[PDB]
């Protein structure tokens, strides 16, 4: 049911290969947590992840949505 | 900074003056644990809920330290030491070699 190990793994993987890049990885991490939220209601590691992503996104001043490509 | 992992450590018994009581081996690969413990810890199955909570508390209060990189699995070694009448005695020594490191 709870798929937080896969979110943790993907984020650790993304940060091993390298602030613009970290914010992307943090947004993917946030998206991943949201997608398994329903199966992690009582999971401690899950709620720690959600706290850590927010803490890390406040640091490095990440945007929650990610930049759009501008017109040609 | 490099994250929590196992590092080489060969213990030479001559270098510590232990060759007088240790007949065999002349030394052994002991290893040691070292490295930073950053969020997320729960990407390892050898950490703990307390270490995960401490890391969360540390992020809100820097006075509370981060988890520490320590051995989470140790293995035994057999050694020969000298007994009475210079009798060579085989003995197993538990928790001598690092087999795994984790953030605790
Ligand atoms: Cl965590
Ligand atoms: Cl002993």
Selecting from 3.40.630.10, 3.40.50.720, 3.40.50.10310, 2.10.90.10, what CATH number does the domain B1-104 have? 2.10.90.10
- Identify which of A22, A17, A21 has the alpha carbon closest to the alpha carbon of residue A52: A22
B56 interfacial to chain A (CB closer than 8 Å):
yes
On whether any CB of chain A is under 8 Å from the CB of B49, the answer is yes
For ligand 1, an ion, list residues with CB under 5 A: A 48; B 40-42, 52
Q: Give the DSSP H or E segment for B80.
A: strand B69-82
What number of C-beta contacts closer than 8 Å exist between A and B?
37
Cβ contact A48–B56 (<8 Å): yes
A7: closest CA among A61, A53, A65?
A: A53
Nearest to B41 by CA among B4, B71, B10: B4
Residue A31's Cβ-side half-sphere holds a number of Cα atoms within 13 Å equal to 11
- Is residue A24 a contact partner of residue A53, using CB atoms and an 8 Å limit? no
At a CB cut-off of 8 Å and minimum separation 6, what does A9 contact? B43
- Secondary structure of chain A in the HEC alphabet? CCCHHHHHHHHHHHHHCCCHHHHHHHHHHHHHHHHHHHHCCCCHHHHHHHHHHHHHHHHHHCCCCCCCCCCC
What is the biggest distance separating any 2 CA atoms in chain A, rounded to whole angstroms? 47
Q: Where are the domains of chain B?
A: 1-104
For chain A, which residues make up each domain, given as ranges?
1-72
């Amino acid at each position: 049911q709870c798929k937080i190990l896969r979110c943790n793994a993907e984020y650790v993987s993304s940060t091993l290969s390298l602030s613009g890049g970290l914010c992307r990885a943090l947004r993917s991490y946030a998206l991943c947590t949201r997608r398994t939220a329903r199966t992690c209601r009582g999971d401690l590691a899950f709620h720690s992840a959600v706290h850590g992503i927010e803490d890390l996104m406040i640091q490095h001043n990440c945007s929650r949505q990610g930049p759009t490509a501008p017109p040609p | 900074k490099s994250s929590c992992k196992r590092h080489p450590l060969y213990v030479d018994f001559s270098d510590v003056g232990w060759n007088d009581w240790i007949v065999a081996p002349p030394g052994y690969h002991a290893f040691y644990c070292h490295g930073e413990c950053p969020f997320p810890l729960a990407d390892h199955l050898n950490s703990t809920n307390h270490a995960i909570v401490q890391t969360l508390v540390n992020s809100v209060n820097s006075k509370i330290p981060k988890a520490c990189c320590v051995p989470t699995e140790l293995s035994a070694i057999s050694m020969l030491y000298l007994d009475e009448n210079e009798k060579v005695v085989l003995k197993n020594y538990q928790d001598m070699v690092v087999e795994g490191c984790g953030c605790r």
